[PDB]
């Protein structure tokens, strides 16, 4: 429990809640903080400790999906801090709070299961558990960050920083921010 | 295990026998048996033993 919480480039406290319905799932003070996040996935004990696992560690560990890229982890975290810096430079204010509110604004709301009333496959809407909500937001913004730097010019960090800009600070500017309306309107008419 | 050859053909034989000796005799295995506990001569503290002494 440190005497000052800093990244060597900006501060580590000053993280809050925006839509209370996701309290205790976005985590920034679980029990500590670090110069820069790194982990094995140690919080894999249950669903609850990965529900209340820190957000920066959450995203830094999560951004290694497409196979052999967890086989390049140092430079990947170089990319993540690069992207946070790119946000800090383009849009100014601290990128971590902005990504907090961006996950909030690009969280889904409901999921529809497949229970045929008389036999034909229908859908039925259940309220998205807030943890699955935040994870859909983060882990489909990561999908967008790959779909961008896969079929575009921008590198990984630049794509990620653009997405975190235009998610909370822009409408219809994310693969996640369209998945959101798709899921919620599906839930409406498929109640 | 063993084979036998016959004018009509082979037969196969297998014999599986426990070892005889409870102790570790020549073909006796380990002394204990892989089973429960028991008593050979347990100890209690039953008989009245009240304050007096003896001087040896």
């Amino acid at each position: 429990t440190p005497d000052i919480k800093l990244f060597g480039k900006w501060s580590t406290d000053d993280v809050q809640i925006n839509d209370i319905s996701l309290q205790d799932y976005i985590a920034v003070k679980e029990k500590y903080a670090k110069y820069l996040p790194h982990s094995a996935g140690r919080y894999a004990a249950k669903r609850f400790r990965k529900a209340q696992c820190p957000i920066v560690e959450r995203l830094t560990n999560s951004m290694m999906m497409h196979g052999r890229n967890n086989g390049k982890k140092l430079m990947t975290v170089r990319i993540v801090k690069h992207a946070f810096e790119i946000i800090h430079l383009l849009t100014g204010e601290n990128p971590l709070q902005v990504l907090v509110n961006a996950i909030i604004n690009s969280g889904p709301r409901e999921d529809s299961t497949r229970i045929g009333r008389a036999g034909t496959v229908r859908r039925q809407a259940v309220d998205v558990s807030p943890l699955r909500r935040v994870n859909q937001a983060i882990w489909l913004l990561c999908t967008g960050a790959r779909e961008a730097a896969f079929r575009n010019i921008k590198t990984i960090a630049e794509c990620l920083a653009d997405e975190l800009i235009n998610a909370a600070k822009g409408s219809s500017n994310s693969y996640a921010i369209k998945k959101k309306d798709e899921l919620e309107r599906v839930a409406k008419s498929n109640r | 295990v063993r084979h036998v050859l016959l004018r009509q053909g082979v037969l196969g034989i297998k014999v599986k026998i426990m070892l005889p000796w409870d102790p570790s005799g020549k073909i006796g295995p380990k002394k204990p048996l892989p089973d429960h506990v028991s008593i050979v001569e347990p100890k209690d503290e039953i008989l009245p033993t009240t304050p007096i002494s003896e001087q040896k």
Partner: protein
């Protein structure tokens, strides 16, 4: 955490809590180092579980009349309680009311006793149909 335990410890407990009980420990560490000398087993796996279930036994020993173990303390105390002093109960209770039907019956015997002729005669309809 844990698993439901076996016959090799059920026997190893309902022998030692029978004989070694008064000389058996009150907590696990004691139970295990008791097992080291007065147990004969080919391992420490059986020994650790014996010590755990003897911890269980002392959990269960002083817990009132307990049906899941048997020891001297229990044996004697229950027998000694049954060894009892009937309070003044030859009359079995104080003054007794009895029925005129019973009195007329005991007329055949030409018998009576401390009597008050309990009256309970009329009925309100009986066993449910």
């Amino acid at each position: 955490m844990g698993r439901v335990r076996t016959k090799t410890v059920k026997k190893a407990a309902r022998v030692i809590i029978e004989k070694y009980y008064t000389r058996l420990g009150n907590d696990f560490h004691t139970n295990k180092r008791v097992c080291e000398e007065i147990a004969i087993i080919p391992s420490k796996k059986l020994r650790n579980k014996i010590a755990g279930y003897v911890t269980h036994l002392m959990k269960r020993i002083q817990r009132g009349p307990v049906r899941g173990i048997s020891i001297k303390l229990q044996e004697e105390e229950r027998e000694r309680r049954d060894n009892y002093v009937p309070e003044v109960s030859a009359l079995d209770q104080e003054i007794i009311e009895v029925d005129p039907d019973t009195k007329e019956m005991l007329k055949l015997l030409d018998f009576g006793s401390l009597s008050n002729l309990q009256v309970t005669q009329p009925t309100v309809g009986m066993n449910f149909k």
